[PDB]
Design a protein around this ligand. Structure first.
Ligand SMILES: CCOC(=O)Nc1cc(-c2ccc(C)c(NS(C)(=O)=O)c2)nn2c(C)nnc12
Lengths: 113, 113
């Protein structure tokens, strides 16, 4: 796999604009949610993903997609059913692979979160 | 957030016995599949997960379910659609939470792979 930085930044950018709560824009601090570190082993956010793309940290487009999946899974695990954070996370899970496709990324439909 | 070792081990054992191809029993070695580590960043197998439960490496029942999910995702990514290995992994993705429930574990259906 190759890292297509333009295609990967387009994908993050589309997700950033669809994030109406701005809940995925920045890393979660203990200051914000004191118990978050206790629940979530692999925190990740769209600013951190953009930096990972721009720096070449991700080896492939697939790794960027897996980072977005992880970010969405985190919010579904942490947040109770019915809260706006849980509901936007569910919406993201529903659309993120379509957004990836719409940016020209290859999606493994059977394997994808 | 408590690791329920008996129920997690029971869960791993049920998956072991349902693994007819034995494709999840042991770590994949480069000596058999030299490209495996190139494709798959997060290798995990039922023997490794059993050891992680036994040692208390996993912090929670959720972490054990996520390790099993990653094992299944690995097989769906690595094995081409149409192969018996890809097809068993499709089956496992569709039943692993059902098996977890049969072993008395709680599942997060919205979050789960
Ligand atoms: C019961 C409390 O639950 C939570 O507040 N959960 C979460 C909240 C945020 C979050 C961050 C930053 C902002 C600006 C906001 N926007 S707001 C306060 O208007 O909704 C939200 N992110 N987040 C992520 C990721 N995962 N869970 C959460």
């Amino acid at each position: 796999g190759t890292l297509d930085k333009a295609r990967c930044l387009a994908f993050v950018h589309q997700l950033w604009d669809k994030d109406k709560l701005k809940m995925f824009h920045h890393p979660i601090s203990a200051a914000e949610l004191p118990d978050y570190h206790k629940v979530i082993n692999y925190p990740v956010d769209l600013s951190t993903i953009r930096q990972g793309i721009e720096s070449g940290k991700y080896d492939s487009d697939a790794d960027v997609q897996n980072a977005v999946a992880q970010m969405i899974a985190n919010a579904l695990e942490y947040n109770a059913k019915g809260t706006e954070w849980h509901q936007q996370a569910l919406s993201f899970r529903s659309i993120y692979l379509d957004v990836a496709r719409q940016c020209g990324l290859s999606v493994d439909d059977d394997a994808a979160y």
